[PDB]
Amino acid sequence: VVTLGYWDIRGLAHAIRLLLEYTETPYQERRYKAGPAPDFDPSDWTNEKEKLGLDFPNLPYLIDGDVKLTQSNAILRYIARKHNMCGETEVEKQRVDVLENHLMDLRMAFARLCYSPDFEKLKPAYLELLPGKLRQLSRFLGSRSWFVGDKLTFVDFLAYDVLDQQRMFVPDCPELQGNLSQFLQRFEALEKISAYMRSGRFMKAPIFWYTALWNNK
Amino acid sequence: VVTLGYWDIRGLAHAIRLLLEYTETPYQERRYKAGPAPDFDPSDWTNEKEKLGLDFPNLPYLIDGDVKLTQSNAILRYIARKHNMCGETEVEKQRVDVLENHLMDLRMAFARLCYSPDFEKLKPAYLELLPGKLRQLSRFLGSRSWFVGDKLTFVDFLAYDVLDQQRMFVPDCPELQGNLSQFLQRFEALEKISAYMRSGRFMKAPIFWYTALWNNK
Numbered sequence: 001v002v003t004l005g006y007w008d009i010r011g012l013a014h015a016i017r018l019l020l021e022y023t024e025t026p027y028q029e030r031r032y033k034a035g036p037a038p039d040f041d042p043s044d045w046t047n048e049k050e051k052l053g054l055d056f057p058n059l060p061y062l063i064d065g066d067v068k069l070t071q072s073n074a075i076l077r078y079i080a081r082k083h084n085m086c087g088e089t090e091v092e093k094q095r096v097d098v099l100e101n102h103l104m105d106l107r108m109a110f111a112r113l114c115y116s117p118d119f120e121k122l123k124p125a126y127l128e129l130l131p132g133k134l135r136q137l138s139r140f141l142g143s144r145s146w147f148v149g150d151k152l153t154f155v156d157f158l159a160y161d162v163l164d165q166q167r168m169f170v171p172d173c174p175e176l177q178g179n180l181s182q183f184l185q186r187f188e189a190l191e192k193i194s195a196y197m198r199s200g201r202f203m204k205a206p207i208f209w210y211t212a213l214w215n216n217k
Numbered sequence: 218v219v220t221l222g223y224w225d226i227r228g229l230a231h232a233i234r235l236l237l238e239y240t241e242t243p244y245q246e247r248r249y250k251a252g253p254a255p256d257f258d259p260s261d262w263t264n265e266k267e268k269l270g271l272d273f274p275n276l277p278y279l280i281d282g283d284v285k286l287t288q289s290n291a292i293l294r295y296i297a298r299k300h301n302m303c304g305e306t307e308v309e310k311q312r313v314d315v316l317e318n319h320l321m322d323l324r325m326a327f328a329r330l331c332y333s334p335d336f337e338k339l340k341p342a343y344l345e346l347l348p349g350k351l352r353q354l355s356r357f358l359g360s361r362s363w364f365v366g367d368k369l370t371f372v373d374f375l376a377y378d379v380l381d382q383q384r385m386f387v388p389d390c391p392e393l394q395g396n397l398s399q400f401l402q403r404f405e406a407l408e409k410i411s412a413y414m415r416s417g418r419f420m421k422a423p424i425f426w427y428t429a430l431w432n433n434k
């Protein structure tokens with residue numbers, strides 16, 4: 001049994017949670033709590049940051065016995081290696097590495113906007129360059145089942161999470177209809193993922209920390 | 218022969234340059250130019266961004282025949298695989314994946330500060346938290362020769378680049394003295410690294426884009 005440590009929000013741990021469910025890895029969760037508004041006291045975490053034995057303490061973390069990890073990408077790669085959900089050939093590895101890093105860029109660009117107090121002033125600019133970014137991903141996937149080829153890999157779980165955040169933001173964006181819509185359903189159709197979403201362990205919201213100008217709950 | 222595209226700065230391509238040199242990969246460079254101040258016209262790149270055949274156009278890129286890549290970490294992984302400078306055991310791969318992502322955090326937190334107009338206001342806060350970040354790295358490396366074990370890996374190139382930046386910023390920081398100072402020298406003492414540094418291909422500056430509040434040239 002493994003332990004996943006993160007806040008009581010969706011954030012970065014969403015794709016990790018889906019992956020642990022898909023792989024049927026026995027896990028429990030250390031959800032951390034902030035104090036009330038407006039202070040949002042990080043005490044719950046900060047009093048424990050150093051006593052966990054992590055090499056570079058951060059959130060999320062995963063503990064699997066004496067394996068003690070930080071960094072979301074690193075945590076996903078670890079579960080993926082135990083389940084053969086990494087690339088197999090070099091071209092598949094090239095696809096994983098590029099997408100892993102590109103999706104973080106798209107991730108990070110969206111978070112910046114929703115955390116900035118100039119949110120309203122920045123919104124239109126983001127929405128302009130968005131369809132083009134979406135068109136790039138639509139070109140990449142092509143008529144493929146999954147993003148790296150025929151095999152489901154952990155990058156598909158990142159793609160879904162990133163795509164899901166954009167769909168929650170502007171659900172009417174026509175560049176999200178097409179093979180990119182096909183992809184979202186096909187992932188949600190997966191046996192273990194669908195049953196996870198039908199349960200009460202599922203966290204569709206909030207995507208962001210409470211000090212964000214945008215959220216879904 | 219391979220082609221590395223990036224601006225005429227140090228930036229993100231520093232680690233990749235050192236790597237291409239250490240591995241003796243034959244390469245040339247498409248270095249991109251901005252217009253003069255204050256506009257800094259990006260047109261040399263923008264007029265070309267789409268015609269290169271990259272899946273997700275960005276800088277740096279690398280072209281090695283029909284392999285055409287973007288994202289710095291993905292570019293480094295590709296050269297590393299050709300020269301067995303990735304992890305070998307599970308433990309080694311755990312260390313590579315966590316450090317790859319951790320050092321990007323460190324890299325980006327520093328960039329944030331040096332591009333912020335509130336630079337002077339934020340400088341003291343950064344310098345308080347920094348000794349602790351450096352002590353974490355110092356504990357991790359330990360008495361080891363390299364960061365992932367016995368073998369040089371691509372993560373040691375990222376480590377050096379990130380540490381070099383801190384060393385240029387605050388050279389008198391006492392937490393930089395010790396095994397992390399030994400590490401910097403050891404890397405610079407590498408036969409093909411040292412030679413590259415004694416040449417005129419070598420770019421110790423500027424670390425940042427010109428719009429930055431801090432730089433070394």
Ligand SMILES: N[C@@H](CCC(=O)N[C@@H](CS[C@H](CO)COc1ccc([N+](=O)[O-])cc1)C(=O)NCC(=O)O)C(=O)O
Nearest residue numbers: 011012058059060071072073107108111207208209322
């Ligand atoms: N590269 C690292 C980053 C870890 C990190 O950022 N730690 C945050 C997380 S999220 C932060 C809190 O609001 C979340 O904000 C975001 C950012 C992006 C997205 N997103 O979806 O793209 C959502 C929320 C933190 O709570 N701990 C910092 C600390 O203890 O010092 C990784 O991969 O794990």
Ligand SMILES: N[C@@H](CCC(=O)N[C@@H](CS[C@H](CO)COc1ccc([N+](=O)[O-])cc1)C(=O)NCC(=O)O)C(=O)O
Nearest residue numbers: 228229274275276277287288289290324328424425426
């Ligand atoms: N995660 C990617 C990032 C690539 C990227 O940022 N391309 C930027 C400049 S890098 C940029 C220029 O100002 C960086 O800002 C900095 C500056 C310094 C440092 N650093 O580590 O010191 C990091 C980022 C660019 O030229 N392309 C933008 C575009 O084509 O739209 C990767 O790993 O490659």
